[PDB]
Amino acid sequence: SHMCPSGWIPYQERCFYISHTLRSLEESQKYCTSLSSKLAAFDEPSKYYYEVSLPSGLEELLDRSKSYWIQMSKKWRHQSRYCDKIKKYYQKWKRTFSECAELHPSICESEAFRFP
């Protein structure tokens, strides 16, 4: 099957890493890249631009008082000075837009590793 290292959240063939460190989008992207990872991708499913569906294991570990930088969803964009972060509204996390320079924690993802 697939596994993730200590402190990473498994889902499917992926592993998520929550970085609590406040950074701009660009610096969050660079940080994920330094982990041989990428900003976490949640493009689908989405019927409207603000919709995001997160795996439970990840969602339950997010701080509801914070917004997290994630991968920009290109399907909703016709480069841009706005970037995409998830933010909690009442009971639901939503995709929201912010100027890319804003300081937020972020979520990276890598592939999971197989074990024989």
Curated annotation (Swiss-Prot):
Residues 4-110 form the C-type lectin domain. Disulfide bonds join C4-C15, C32-C108, C83-C100. Keywords: Disulfide bond, Glycoprotein, Lectin, Membrane, Phosphoprotein, Receptor, Signal-anchor, Transmembrane, Transmembrane helix. One of its GO terms (cellular component) is plasma membrane. Pre-B-cells and B-cells but not terminally differentiated plasma cells. Signal peptide: none annotated. Phosphorylated upon engagement of the B-cell receptor, probably by LYN or SYK. Homodimer; disulfide-linked. Associates with CD5. Interacts (tyrosine phosphorylated) with PTPN6/SHP-1. Co-receptor of B cell receptor (BCR) that plays both positive and negative roles on B-cell functions. Recognizes the Sm/ribonucleoprotein (RNP) self-antigen ligand, and coligation of CD72 and BCR inhibits BCR signaling. Mechanistically, ligand binding leads to the recruitment of PTPN6/SHP-1 to the BCR complex which is inhibitory to BCR signaling. Acts also as a ligand for CD5 and thereby plays a critical role in maintaining regulatory T and B-cell homeostasis. This is B-cell differentiation antigen CD72. It comes from Mus musculus (Mouse). The lineage of its organism: Eukaryota, Metazoa, Chordata, Craniata, Vertebrata. The chain holds residues 232 to 348 of 354 of the full protein.
